[PDB]
Design an enzyme around this catalytic site. Sequence first.
Site, short mmCIF file in Angstrom:
data_model
loop_
_atom_site.label_atom_id
_atom_site.label_comp_id
_atom_site.label_asym_id
_atom_site.label_seq_id
_atom_site.Cartn_x
_atom_site.Cartn_y
_atom_site.Cartn_z
N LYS A 1 -2.54 6.00 -4.42
CA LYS A 1 -3.63 6.90 -4.12
C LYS A 1 -3.35 8.27 -4.72
CE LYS A 1 -3.79 4.60 0.42
NZ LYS A 1 -2.34 4.52 0.73
N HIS B 1 -7.59 9.38 -2.52
CA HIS B 1 -7.05 9.26 -1.15
C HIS B 1 -8.03 9.80 -0.11
CE1 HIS B 1 -2.92 9.13 1.05
NE2 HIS B 1 -3.90 8.82 1.90
N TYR C 1 3.06 10.13 0.57
CA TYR C 1 4.02 9.55 1.52
C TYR C 1 5.46 9.91 1.18
CZ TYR C 1 -0.04 6.62 2.77
OH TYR C 1 -1.30 6.15 3.10
N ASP D 1 0.84 -1.18 0.00
CA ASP D 1 0.00 0.00 0.00
C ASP D 1 0.88 1.24 0.00
OD1 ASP D 1 -2.82 1.19 0.38
OD2 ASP D 1 -1.56 2.24 1.87
N1 LIG Z 1 -5.90 5.82 3.23
C1 LIG Z 1 -5.43 6.59 4.20
O1 LIG Z 1 -5.80 7.76 4.37
C2 LIG Z 1 -4.43 6.00 5.15
C3 LIG Z 1 -4.23 6.56 6.40
C4 LIG Z 1 -3.42 5.91 7.32
C5 LIG Z 1 -2.79 4.74 6.97
N2 LIG Z 1 -2.94 4.25 5.72
C6 LIG Z 1 -2.17 3.02 5.29
O2 LIG Z 1 -2.28 2.05 6.31
C7 LIG Z 1 -0.95 1.67 6.75
C8 LIG Z 1 -0.97 1.19 8.17
O3 LIG Z 1 -1.39 2.24 9.07
P1 LIG Z 1 -0.35 3.09 9.94
O4 LIG Z 1 0.96 3.20 9.25
O5 LIG Z 1 -1.06 4.34 10.30
O6 LIG Z 1 -0.16 2.27 11.29
P2 LIG Z 1 -0.20 0.77 11.86
O7 LIG Z 1 0.08 -0.18 10.76
O8 LIG Z 1 -1.43 0.66 12.66
O9 LIG Z 1 1.01 0.86 12.90
C9 LIG Z 1 2.36 1.08 12.45
C10 LIG Z 1 3.22 1.20 13.68
O10 LIG Z 1 3.19 -0.05 14.41
C11 LIG Z 1 4.51 -0.53 14.60
N3 LIG Z 1 4.48 -1.98 14.51
C12 LIG Z 1 4.27 -2.71 13.37
N4 LIG Z 1 4.24 -4.01 13.57
C13 LIG Z 1 4.44 -4.13 14.94
C14 LIG Z 1 4.54 -5.26 15.77
N5 LIG Z 1 4.43 -6.52 15.32
N6 LIG Z 1 4.77 -5.04 17.08
C15 LIG Z 1 4.88 -3.78 17.52
N7 LIG Z 1 4.80 -2.64 16.83
C16 LIG Z 1 4.59 -2.89 15.53
C17 LIG Z 1 5.35 0.15 13.53
O11 LIG Z 1 6.72 0.25 13.95
P3 LIG Z 1 7.99 0.00 13.00
O12 LIG Z 1 7.62 0.43 11.61
O13 LIG Z 1 9.07 0.86 13.65
O14 LIG Z 1 8.30 -1.48 13.09
C18 LIG Z 1 4.68 1.52 13.43
O15 LIG Z 1 5.14 2.39 14.46
C19 LIG Z 1 -0.14 2.92 6.45
O16 LIG Z 1 1.27 2.71 6.49
C20 LIG Z 1 -0.67 3.28 5.07
O17 LIG Z 1 -0.11 2.39 4.11
C21 LIG Z 1 -3.76 4.83 4.83
#
Ligand SMILES: NC(=O)c1ccc[n+]([C@@H]2O[C@H](COP(=O)([O-])OP(=O)(O)OC[C@H]3O[C@@H](n4cnc5c(N)ncnc54)[C@H](OP(=O)(O)O)[C@@H]3O)[C@@H](O)[C@H]2O)c1
Length: 318
Positions: free
Chosen positions: A80, A113, A51, A46
């Site tokens: 997006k 997006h 980004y 994704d």
């Molecule tokens: N469409 C939209 O508007 C939108 C908005 C938000 C997000 N997104 C997408 O969704 C993805 C995921 O959401 P997000 O990045 O907000 O957050 P998330 O996936 O909920 O959390 C990411 C965080 O969790 C940590 N983490 C990952 N695996 C872990 C594990 N097994 N144990 C402990 N900590 C862990 C990561 O640390 P490290 O990386 O340091 O390991 C990072 O700090 C985004 O990257 C993006 O691709 C889209």
Amino acid sequence: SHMASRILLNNGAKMPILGLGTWKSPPGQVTEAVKVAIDVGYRHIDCAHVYQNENEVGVAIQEKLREQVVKREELFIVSKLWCTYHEKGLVKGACQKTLSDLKLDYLDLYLIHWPTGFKPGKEFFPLDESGNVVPSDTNILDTWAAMEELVDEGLVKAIGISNFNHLQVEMILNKPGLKYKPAVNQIECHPYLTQEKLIQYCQSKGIVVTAYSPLGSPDRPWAKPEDPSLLEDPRIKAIAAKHNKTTAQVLIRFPMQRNLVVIPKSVTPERIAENFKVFDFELSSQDMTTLLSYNRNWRVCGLLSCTSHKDYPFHEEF
Ligand SMILES: NC(=O)c1ccc[n+]([C@@H]2O[C@H](COP(=O)([O-])OP(=O)(O)OC[C@H]3O[C@@H](n4cnc5c(N)ncnc54)[C@H](OP(=O)(O)O)[C@@H]3O)[C@@H](O)[C@H]2O)c1
């Protein structure tokens, strides 16, 4: 574990239910993160232009294709369209910039997006002198028509939406002359924002839902110490312990068992691998209902600078 790896979209293509998120993945770490992810089984990445790391994501994809670790047809790459490109005459170029950065000749899925269009220009959040984000006039039905053209030009295999509320989804579904339905609505979803109403609506229309921030985005830039923390919630840790899995693994399996796609982000090799090992256990119905009970309508991503935009999505109940 009574869990197929891909879900069928309404364009006839199959989408891997587990993908790697890349928001906030530093450019000097994301190439290795994506390489590791593909090496350990991920087939869905994704991405987004906003980004600012698509070039580096693309380096990884291209290397793994060159190494023949995977074939292009086995990958499912999502990006997006950012808010400053909602104009008819800008959509194709925005898609092509993403394709050129990712070093691809098509995307598997391209999303609007956010439903909010902003004034075009260099700034991703163009501001007036008083700090408001300057809107575009282009209405979203017209943006959708521009997305449909990308399918017809071969740039993308599927189109969809992100952060659309149910009335905005309905506006697309009711569009005069609609040519392609949205394939996906990508929305925030986790035990503190369970999204029952919007998920049911989308699924009832054949639109697949992707859950973002499934771990509660602990690295979000506006995190406050007092905020709730999914990974540290003792109730979720207890479910994980019962199943001999990590809390993150429970948080990833949860949306999978709701027939959602889920896109946890990590740049840590061990966590990238951990997060994929979620096809070897099952949460009970009681576990699922218990996790759903934790809903508090808590949002990582509220687009809080844009609450006055005519198309701001989060005033509606859902
Ligand atoms: N469409 C939209 O508007 C939108 C908005 C938000 C997000 N997104 C997408 O969704 C993805 C995921 O959401 P997000 O990045 O907000 O957050 P998330 O996936 O909920 O959390 C990411 C965080 O969790 C940590 N983490 C990952 N695996 C872990 C594990 N097994 N144990 C402990 N900590 C862990 C990561 O640390 P490290 O990386 O340091 O390991 C990072 O700090 C985004 O990257 C993006 O691709 C889209």
